Amino acid sequence: MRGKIYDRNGKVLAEDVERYKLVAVIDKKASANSKKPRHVVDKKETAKKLSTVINMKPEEIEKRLSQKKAFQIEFGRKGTNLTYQDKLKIEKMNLPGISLLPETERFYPNGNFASHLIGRAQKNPDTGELKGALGVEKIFDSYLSGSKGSLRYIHDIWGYIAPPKRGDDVHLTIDSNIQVFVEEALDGMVERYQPKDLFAVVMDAKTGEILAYSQRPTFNPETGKDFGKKWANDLYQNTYEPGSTFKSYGLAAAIQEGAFDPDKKYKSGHRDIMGSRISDWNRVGWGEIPMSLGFTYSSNTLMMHLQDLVGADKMKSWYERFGFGKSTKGMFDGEAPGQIGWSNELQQKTSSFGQSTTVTPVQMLQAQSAFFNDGNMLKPWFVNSVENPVSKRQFYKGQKQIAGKPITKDTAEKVEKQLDLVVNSKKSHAANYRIDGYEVEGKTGTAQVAAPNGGGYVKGPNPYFVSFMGDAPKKNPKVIVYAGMSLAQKNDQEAYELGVSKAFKPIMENTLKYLNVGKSKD
């Protein structure tokens, strides 16, 4: 067998199953050698009797039974993936020339479910051998594959090279219950907005475990629908100009260097950099205001100010210590490193509010974790264990690791206080993200998206990648939820206004409810 892929609760996400294939011998030669006929003798009534199961047009079955004088015939995709109780039903008809041959298929019980993480294994027609083409299935192919026991190698994750055979089972950190909430809410967003790109990830604030992840446009692993259009996994392989979500780190840097004072007033409005009026989202500003406010509002000028006070060279190092521009050394294939945009003053400035600079969504989880774990960034991981279920031998076992402490405990508490404000302030420009009964906090994340191949940015009515990096319960969270949407093709206006609030709210509410986190008032 190819090994199974389980969730954290032990529920199967992928497994091998035995299905069957219909074959009909149509040539008299078969029955020339003995008494009882071994070819279809009454095409007409055989076709009717078979019109009981599956793609039952009796005449279309007769067309196929009537074809040339080939020995044996198949029935396309309908003539495959037949269940065992379908087999039994036909076997009782005892028809001349009809047979079902066993074939193994990879089965994903949920169909479209974390499609881009789980991945998909393709079948070699001739041999019946399954081989991972994307996601888990590809990374862990050798271990999964009960056959390939020559020299087993973990794709790109250099090491663990442990050299009638059953395969190895892969245990993920995913919780099927939380994954449901994600898939449902993303379906909603696609219906509403029809974005070009979309993701949501739920991470355990205190471990770095990925509890749920999906993206649109994804594929259906079961059917092979849409597989190969978008190959890239958003979370690990695709880069984004993150936008205002990225200010959180620009702030932390400052707070620590002692350059940010929440009550100190700064000049908002415009900032002339390299012959360009880089201005706030409102284009006009709010004049002289406290920094605390600027951040609540998401002032682009604030971050630019703060960069100047701290210093270019020092801010670059700050973003590096927050794990950006480098792989998170997660368990996934060809994880994208992104890059800190720092070639000139323009790139540097635009970076502090999340342009020029590219990140993996994961880099961002890693960063954000700092604020709730006393300045320690947690390595985000999704693989709980790879173990042969016969021997119980663990070839890998995942655990929570500290990918760095860039910031202090004091700094983290002060950052959290501002994140609380961003949502729960009197003048909050992010009330849309508030939930009933539960205390939320996080950062709005509106960004311009780059032209796919060459040119500048995408233009249009609202050509924005909106995001929210939220956590709850406030101060001492259970989870981080990061949703991002790129280029809504429908209701682009509401998209800019609400952002991903319409997806974050349900996911977080449902998750907290399922994890039995206490409420207040309805």
Binding site: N282, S298, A447
Partner: peptide, 5 residues
Amino acid sequence: GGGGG
């Protein structure tokens, strides 16, 4: 962006 509301 950042707000818008």
